[PDB]
Symmetry: D2
Subunit: 334 residues, 4 copies
Amino acid sequence: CSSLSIRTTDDKSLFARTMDFTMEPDSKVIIVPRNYGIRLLEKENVVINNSYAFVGMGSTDITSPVLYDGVNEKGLMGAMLYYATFATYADEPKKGTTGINPVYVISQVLGNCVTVDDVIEKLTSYTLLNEANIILGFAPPLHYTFTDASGESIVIEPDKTGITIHRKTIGVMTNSPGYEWHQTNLRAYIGVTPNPPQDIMMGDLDLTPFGQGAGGLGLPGDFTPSARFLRVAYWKKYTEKAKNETEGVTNLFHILSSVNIPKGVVLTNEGKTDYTIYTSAMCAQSKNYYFKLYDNSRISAVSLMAENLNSQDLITFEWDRKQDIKQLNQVNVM
Amino acid sequence: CSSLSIRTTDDKSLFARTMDFTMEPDSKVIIVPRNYGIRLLEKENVVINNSYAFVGMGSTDITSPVLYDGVNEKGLMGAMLYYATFATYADEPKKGTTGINPVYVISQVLGNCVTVDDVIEKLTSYTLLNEANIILGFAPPLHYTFTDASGESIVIEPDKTGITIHRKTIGVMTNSPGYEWHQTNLRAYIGVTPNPPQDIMMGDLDLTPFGQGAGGLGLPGDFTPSARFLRVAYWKKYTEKAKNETEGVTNLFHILSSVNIPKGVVLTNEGKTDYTIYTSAMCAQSKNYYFKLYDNSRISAVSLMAENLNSQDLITFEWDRKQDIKQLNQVNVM
Amino acid sequence: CSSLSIRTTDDKSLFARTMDFTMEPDSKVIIVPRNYGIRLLEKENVVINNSYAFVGMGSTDITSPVLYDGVNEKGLMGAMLYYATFATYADEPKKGTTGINPVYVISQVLGNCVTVDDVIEKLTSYTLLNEANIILGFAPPLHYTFTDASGESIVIEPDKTGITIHRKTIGVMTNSPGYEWHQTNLRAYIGVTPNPPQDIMMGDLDLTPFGQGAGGLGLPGDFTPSARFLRVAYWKKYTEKAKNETEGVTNLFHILSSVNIPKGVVLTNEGKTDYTIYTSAMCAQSKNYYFKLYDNSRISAVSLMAENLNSQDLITFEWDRKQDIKQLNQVNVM
Amino acid sequence: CSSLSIRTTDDKSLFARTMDFTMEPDSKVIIVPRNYGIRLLEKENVVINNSYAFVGMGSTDITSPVLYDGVNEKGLMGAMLYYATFATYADEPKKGTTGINPVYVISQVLGNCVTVDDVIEKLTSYTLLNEANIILGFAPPLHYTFTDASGESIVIEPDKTGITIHRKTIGVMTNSPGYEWHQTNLRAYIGVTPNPPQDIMMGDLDLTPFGQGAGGLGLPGDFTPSARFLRVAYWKKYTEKAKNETEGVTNLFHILSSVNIPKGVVLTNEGKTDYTIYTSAMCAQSKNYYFKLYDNSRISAVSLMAENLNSQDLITFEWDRKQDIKQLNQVNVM
């Protein structure tokens, strides 16, 4: 998966992510209303009551709602991303703390924090444990990213040596390795710019670019996590500032399109295709949730604040996996 | 610009392209009805009567309709793409032939040919001339690509040494240099595949990939024409076969998303941003035209065959440059 | 193999090449004296008498001396390099011409031409034929490069469509594909320069290079022919001008060291290691021949003009495959 | 600078490095005899008496001999390399320790340690201080590498957060960033191998490599520290094992030839050329020191054990900057 956040000229903060997996567990957009309550562990019945209502993409297949990404009524934004080979979970909670299933971090954090600091604070009383879940059959290796209404972003990584916290980062996050490795990697590519190389000569031969684009020489085009990090960061740097929230959603989806994996281009060892199942964007100030999926490029929006945040039940929105083509005249839908 | 064509499992042929420019001349989807008549030169009043009706993206700003890409009522598909530094036009027609403005080639070819061979034949009686047009102020450097209802693709390049014709090619085409250069370039990148490298050791150190995606090590991620060529070709090779025309349109748009330029990431010497203004797909057998634009990811369709092909007038469809977000609940449209 | 030619500030022309093969046929530096006579075909006994004496690296394993590279008494320089998949030879000579084994072109050219034009001229009366030789068991796919005392360089390629001649080229040549393909490829890499990228920022993050070298971002480091072409050309462009012939030899060996293959880093499909068996340099005005080999980094020189160019016999110099370490004190030679 | 160590099949350990700088301070090979005594600080007169004799490349321009690299009479090998932007030194020694000039670490370590553990131990009583020297005018940013007679290698980095120690590493070291960053970077390149990609097809087009070499697709050919790290590591992995010490010296120099910078190809911001001034190799068991310099490819050897290790004075060997060409016949030395 890939992810980044931007700031509009409107003083709006937006966060966006791609979901790249080999299978599509039933997911839908879920609204979790205040005081719905969320499990901490799937094999323990302790339920923490959630102070805030929140909206995002998740699963309803286990006891409490599982959120992949989402926005708060308070403006906090966040998402779970894979962190293969690096994510390390303990067997029992560290002394004092309570254990938490890695898969419930977003729902817990979104239901209860306002700022990035709130998030850092809330996690000191928890210990991520190696508890599996019946959807994947194991506890997925994950790292986490959160963005405030203010635009401050953090990265929390459950490393071998313990939780590593990254404060006020560049607002870009994909997969392994660790945030510091990626941020140091940016330095080797500072020469990837929007501008063309000057023409040169080789003896009497005039050498000029094939057309436009040659400032990017060096950016990798493959779909590895590191390559995707570079592409989201550099294109985040250079694409124009969003003037408002709508420009923001469409700019965010443009940047992520450079890291959008078509089915069949990436296969696992297992031979499974790793592709971009969906792409979402969130706005902290409006609390709106936007998304497009593999089979439908039409963006769909759900407003959190439009619902009753004290409803007893979860308010869900199903995916429309058909391509929403608009017919200008009578097309033959085929 | 970038362009490719695929074959569905349905026996359907589709062609798609991106339009990358620094400015948006008024363009709309235009239907040109049979016997509408098309100029050959803008400074001469000879009008060739077109046998076939056709639909595509173009301009109505000069005497006859200018088409950028399009489909026929016969199934022929084609498009004009830039060919900077390579395109060469004569001053006067070669002996016997009539001169043609390079900007009118698609309209003429689409109004009158059925097969790729018809196209090759029709051009032997013409000479592309250096006639400017009032939209750009000059005659743009261009090369052309055409795809039959059968799926056979050709490339026509107005080179220094004359028209170069490429028969039954891989069905990919971006910008300069010449088709043969890019097709040879593919060979250097045959190791870019979907599958992960085996793990290795360095003494006692175990080395394994950061996650998925490493088979692509080597593919360039910049927006140069050569880089874009490679990306469209390799991803055309590895994304899954379209099972029908709709999968075909969405698969085409996925492949091209790897060569979609966000505003600001490519600047000319002039400092102008070169970006993907629109993206279109065509189906030879259905004669349907699909498109999305920069500011709207919702695909829109026009059917050629749904209109009266003997209308006297042009049937046009305007662009909707607003992001067509579908509201699932009452979003606040902002 | 890789090859290039430079011009000193002394008005000296030098040519150098690496020999990359999977096996070392007995080769030695050979002096061919005037009027020694060279076969044209190995299965025909016609012997062309050679007007000029010449020196270079070759084999004495077949009827006439086979030269891989070399200099004349006239200052003409040249070498045979592999051109796999591209080199095409006829079965019978074209009408009029006499057939020539591709393996005897350098000996013939060096024994009889003075300028690059003489070379182009002399080849019009010959047809390269598919005649094998008992060393390789087949006729190797080859292309040729020649450099005048003036410093004018050409490239002769026996293509499918016939001999292709490249006049006054950039003075670089490796393997396939064709000279024009590589010369065009230079244009995609004009941004590879000696100078560092300007520092940039990402929000509040200062991004700066790891150290020196970043102007080269984009140059490929692998040992493919195309990559080696780029490396020799770009490093030829930016390494300092040779002030004299000795600087020339060492500058030439420095440039080629970036395309020097250590045993084990490149294997064929056969699993054979492709490595740099030797590296040579020639000076047109002095007619000196320099060489180093895999196992000895000490450069060895032979002067052509120092021998009797009317000798009846070949004057040969054997390879010293031991590393010629100079002992400053009593080292223990182990 | 670049550096690596290998193990022969002879049970010999060898270490080698390139010296890449913009200027050549007078350097020569220096033998430091036992009990010669080495300063710790240049502005303090405390002299630590050195237990062991050692040989390497260094400067005699300040109070005590400055060594860049070298071997012991005990078999310990090591070198100083730049670590720009990362190296951090204190103003005053930490409580208990004595201050040491970063430029004297090799001399001190080589004169007093046997194993990599001895090295780690010895440094716990010192604090690297920001003391300049009259040669550069400042305290150069450096990191250190050491290799035992056993073949165990470590990396010591004076980081912002304190000395960072890397135990039993892969035996490769160039410049910034930190050792762990480079070791993680290896993982993105595990697909760079000696073996050719399988041939593929694009429709009916057969696609095959230009020749040999395509398994390396992905390796960068630029001279940045990161790119040089990769090249030394991957080529260290795949070049054949040294069967004895001489093969070891020549294999070492072959691997480092991929990271050998010709004058003119890298320029600083200042416009100064950063080039490979010299290249050296050391063998732990024989205590032999080997070197070649920019202008002479002939390897020169000094044996430590051949001198009197109790001499009162330094035993020095000057550089021969002329290219040591061996004349096979009477060449004209020009």
